Amino acid sequence: LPVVFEDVVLHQATILPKTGTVSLEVRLLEASRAFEVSENGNLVVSGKVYQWDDPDPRLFDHPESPT
């Protein structure tokens, strides 16, 4: 699955506890191509995610270095 992200925003950081576990819940709106990762009902990450219809290798050619 070649994937594409767009307009990702990180609102707060999740501090992994030394002991125990923390549950991250991810929700998708395939209609709008949006996702939201929430921790205990508090927004953590929000953006757009959708499959890449036509991957193009040319995107990964290394640009000429200015120096």
Place this chain on the structure above:
Amino acid sequence: LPVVFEDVVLHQATILPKTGTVSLEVRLLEASRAFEVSENGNLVVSGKVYQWDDPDPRLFDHPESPT
């Protein structure tokens, strides 16, 4: 449930056929206070909906008439 809608956008108008039925799907994102309505996988309405914490009856007082 006193509710507040914000930034409501309608994308395409759904035509009810004379016969049969049309299915409407609603998905809420409680964390982001955003909703989204889709039909057959095509976006129909998007926006923000959330519960109104402190209703104010002052808001519904009838505004001064233009004339």
